[PDB]
Amino acid sequence: TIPSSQEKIATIHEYLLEHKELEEAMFSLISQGRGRSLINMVVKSALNIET
Amino acid sequence: PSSQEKIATIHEYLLEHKELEEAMFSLISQGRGRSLINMVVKSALNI
C-alpha cells in the first residue's frame, strides 16, 4: 500500500506546518462541531479537481 | 490551546475520517493545496 497512510498523514502534517492558517482553520471548524462540513467540502473539491 | 494540541486534534479527526485524509492528500500532492487552504479558511471565517 504506497503511498502508505503514514506517508499521507506526514504530507498533510508538513503542509499544515508550512501553512499555519490552514491548521487554525481546520482546528476552528473541528473544535466547533463543524468537521462534517469540512469533510464534505474537501471531498467534493478533491473529486472535482479529479473529475 | 497550544499549536501541538491543535495538530493533535486535527490528527485524531483525520484518523477517524479517512476520506478527509485521502481528499486532502490528493489536493496537496496534485498542487492544489492553495485552493484547499482558501476554501477551508473561508469556511472557518464564516462559522
Curated annotation (Swiss-Prot), chain B:
Superkingdom per UniProt: Viruses
Cellular location(s): Virion; Host cytoplasm
Signal sequence segment: none
Oligomer and partners: Homodimer. Interacts (via C-terminus) with VP1 in the cytoplasm. Capsid VP3 interacts with VP2.
Protein name, per record: Capsid protein VP3
Organism: Drosophila x virus (isolate Chung/1996) (DXV)
